[PDB]
Write a protein that binds this DNA or RNA. Structure first.
Length: 297
RNA sequence: AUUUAUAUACUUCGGCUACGUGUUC
């Protein structure tokens, strides 16, 4: 169980609905998708890295401090205002939060100190139209990009057998030169990675409790969802989009809509996910990653 | 052969990125 540190140094576009939307972190779906496409391009085998590996979502970090998503636990006060405005809780204070030891003023201070990047829109045009030869409008369009301070970035949580971890490290060595976002070929999204161990993160990841904090985007398989939702606090997130090299027409190929729990849901009955298939009318199967990575407290 | 040694005034005034055009198939 290692973590992988990511520093960017170039703006990255991550996207929700259009190109001119900017987003800070990315989900396990696009992460596994990038790993899988990099593997296929490299020509190695996918069986090893399909049904053994567990990937957690990407989360941001700052100078020396790491972050995790806000648990969706019922804190019984009544402000319900400063906490709603909080999105990430530093690791130093995680167990303090889950025991209701976080004060309103401390929450305000954390919100004040949480600057880890800013948003930008760069305007771009496209003269590929008749403009080159005849009177034709240049078509302006915008892309949403997000940048980090020189001491920031994203990090991973990965776990599995050591052989799978070695394969993952190889693939990431390959991948640091492809992208991890949107307009990869337009100049966005190259990174350097580094493997680090953290004593505090390790203790947090190997705790023992009664609840569970979901750190990835997963969906229970058909026969286990019924028992999964006995006592659950969760939010669903729709995940759609097109696919890369499935048929002749990109604009005719579009993945089937899929729904999965978010990255902060709390469950009482642990379930195992699966790599659901979201293909139809296609030559090769298309995958989406739904497999949980729990922390028990 | 015996005293000046450039002197006062003014040291730039007047008149202050327009159009195709932003988004999608």
């Amino acid at each position: 169980t290692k973590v992988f540190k990511l520093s960017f140094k170039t703006p990255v576009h991550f996207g929700k609905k259009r190109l001119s939307d900017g987003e800070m972190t990315i989900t396990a779906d696009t992460l596994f998708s990038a790993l899988f496409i990099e593997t296929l391009q490299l020509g190695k085998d996918t069986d090893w890295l399909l049904n053994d590996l567990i990937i957690s979502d990407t989360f941001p970090y700052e100078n020396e401090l790491y972050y995790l998503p806000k648990p969706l636990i019922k804190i019984d006060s009544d402000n319900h205002k400063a906490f709603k405005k909080l999105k990430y809780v530093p690791v130093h204070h995680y167990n303090q939060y889950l025991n209701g030891e976080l004060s309103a003023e401390d929450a305000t201070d954390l919100n004040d100190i949480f600057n880890i990047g800013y948003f930008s829109l760069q305007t771009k045009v496209s003269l590929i139209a008749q403009e080159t030869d005849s009177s034709a409008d240049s078509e302006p369009y915008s892309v949403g990009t997000f940048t980090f301070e020189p001491e920031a970035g994203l990090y991973f949580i990965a776990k599995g057998s050591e052989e799978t971890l070695d394969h993952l490290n190889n693939i990431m060595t390959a991948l640091q030169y492809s992208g991890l976002g949107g307009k990869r070929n337009a100049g966005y999204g190259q990174f350097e990675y580094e493997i680090i161990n953290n004593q505090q993160l390790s203790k947090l990841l190997n705790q023992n409790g009664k609840h569970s904090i979901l750190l990835s985007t997963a969906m229970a398989k058909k026969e286990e969802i019924e028992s999964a939702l006995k006592e659950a606090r969760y939010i669903l997130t729709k995940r759609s989009g097109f696919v890369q090299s499935t048929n002749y027409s990109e604009m005719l190929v579009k993945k089937s809509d899929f729904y999965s729990f978010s990255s902060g849901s709390v469950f009482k009955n642990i379930f195992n996910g699966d790599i659901f298939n979201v293909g139809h009318n296609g030559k090769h199967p298309v995958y989406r990653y739904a497999k949980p990575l729990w922390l028990e407290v």
